[PDB]
Amino acid sequence: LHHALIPHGKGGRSSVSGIVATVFGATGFLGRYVVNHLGRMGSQVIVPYRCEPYDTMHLRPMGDLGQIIFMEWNGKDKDSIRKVVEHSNVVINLVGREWETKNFDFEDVFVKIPHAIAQVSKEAGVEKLIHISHLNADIKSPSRYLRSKAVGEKEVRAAFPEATIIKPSDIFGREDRFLNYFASMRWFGGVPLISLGKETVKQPVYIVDVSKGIINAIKDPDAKGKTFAFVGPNRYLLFDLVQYIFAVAYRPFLPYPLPHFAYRWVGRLFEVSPFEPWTTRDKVERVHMSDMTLPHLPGLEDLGIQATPLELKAIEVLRRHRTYRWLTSEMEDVKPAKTVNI
């Protein structure tokens, strides 16, 4: 190890840990928390950004002065990535759009730029890489999300043989676009879950669990080339989350089955909005898709993190969607959803 990268301190904010992160697209949900965990023991992140610096303003108070640098970077440009990864012990990739964009497509955001950053990182001389994919990333899956994730996954793995791969099942948290997305369904009448959502199972993962799992993977010397997958402690049927999170939000639960083709029609209609679409056809069939149960891939328990229950850390997020009539209601009133055991 280099003389300037020897870790020191008690793992505090101004302590130095010798890890030099270069998290990509951290101006998002999970990128926020990993940087927050990255600044816990004082690891100088680079966090290249493309949006306005004001939207990146909130990341400053997660590290000592000069520990969180900000570098302008463009995905399409080649030298843009290289200019932020020359002096990085590790490189973390989190770039991903959950909807179609005119200037960036699912393919462009999931095979083009992760391969490009991986090949320059190996060329630059990085020591690690953490490319995240989806646990549901299947090459022949109906969703454009999962197939794009899969083709990029083999691309980065081929480009970087030692690139540790993370595939969390589904991410639930403060602004997950998953729990709040279900809560947002109240404004459009009843819940438009196809066939009452009785045929779909998911296993959500807490942010603190996955975000920690990143830097335990970073500090673990045996994670090079592994393909860790992060899943929650319990799975639940799709109809098993909907009423539970409605109940924990105390909102009027109105399930309403409807045909899938019309569900696709609604998804396309919401896509026509020039601004950020509320829903797209990709997430339309991604919701009803059921996660696998593959145990061969190592999990977060291998690194030494226990997967927190969905019902345990839920009051923090779903409390916002409650009204004044239930803002002070505890989680004793609600009951844990009917877990489907493996």
Partner 1 sequence: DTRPTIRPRNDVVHKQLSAFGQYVAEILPKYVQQVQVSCFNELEIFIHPDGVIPVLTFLRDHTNAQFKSLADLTAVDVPTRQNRFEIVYNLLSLRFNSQIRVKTYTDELTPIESSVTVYKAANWYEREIWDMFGVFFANHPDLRRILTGYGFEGHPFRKDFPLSGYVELRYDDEVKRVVAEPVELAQEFRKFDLNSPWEAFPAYRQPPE
Partner 2 sequence: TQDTQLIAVDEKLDITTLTGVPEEHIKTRKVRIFVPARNNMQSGVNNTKKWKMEFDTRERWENPLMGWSSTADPLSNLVLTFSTKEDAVAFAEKNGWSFDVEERKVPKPKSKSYGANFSWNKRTRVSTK
Partner 3 sequence: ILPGAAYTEKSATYVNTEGRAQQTKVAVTPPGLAREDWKIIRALSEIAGMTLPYDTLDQVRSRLEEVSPNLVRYDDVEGANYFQQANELSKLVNQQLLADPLVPPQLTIKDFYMTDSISRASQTMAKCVKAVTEGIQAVEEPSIC
115-149 as b/e: b if 16+ CB within 10 A? bbbbbbbbebebebbbbbbbbbbeeebebbbbbbb
Give yes or no for residue 213 binding ligand NDP (CB under 6 A).
no
Q: Which residues pair with 340 in a beta bridge?
A: 235
Tell me whether residue 64 or residue 302 sits nearer to partner 2 (CB atom): 64
Asked whether the CA dihedral 279, 284, 288, 293 is positive or negative, the reply is negative
Contacted entry of ligand NDP, partner 1, partner 3, none for residue 56, CB cut-off 5 to 8 Å set by kind:
none
According to DSSP, residue 205 is labeled E
What is the H or E stretch that residue 236 is in? strand 235-237
**Which residues ranging from 51 to 70 are in contact with partner 1 (CB under 8 A)?**
58, 61-62, 64-65
DSSP label of 93? E
Site for partner 2 in 59-78 (CB under 8 A): 64-67
Q: Which of 51, 54, 324, 330 binds ligand NDP (CB under 6 A)?
A: 51
Q: Which two structure tokens, joined as six digits, stand for 269?
A: 């209609």
Question: Is 37 near partner 1 (CB under 8 A)?
Answer: yes
Q: Are 165 and 128 in contact (CB under 8 A)?
A: no
**Closer by beta carbon to partner 3, 5 or else 71:** 5
152 binds ligand NDP (CB under 6 A): no
Q: Which is nearer to partner 3, 4 or 51 (CB)?
A: 4
Q: For residue 158, state whether it binds partner 3 (rule: CB under 8 A).
A: no
Dihedral pair phi/psi, residue 131, rounded to 5°:
-95, 125
Positions touching partner 1 (CB under 8 A) are: 9-10, 12-15, 32-33, 36-37, 58, 61-62, 64-65, 174, 207-208, 211
Positions touching ligand NDP (CB under 6 A) are: 25-31, 50-51, 75, 94-98, 104, 109, 132, 134, 168, 170-171, 176-178
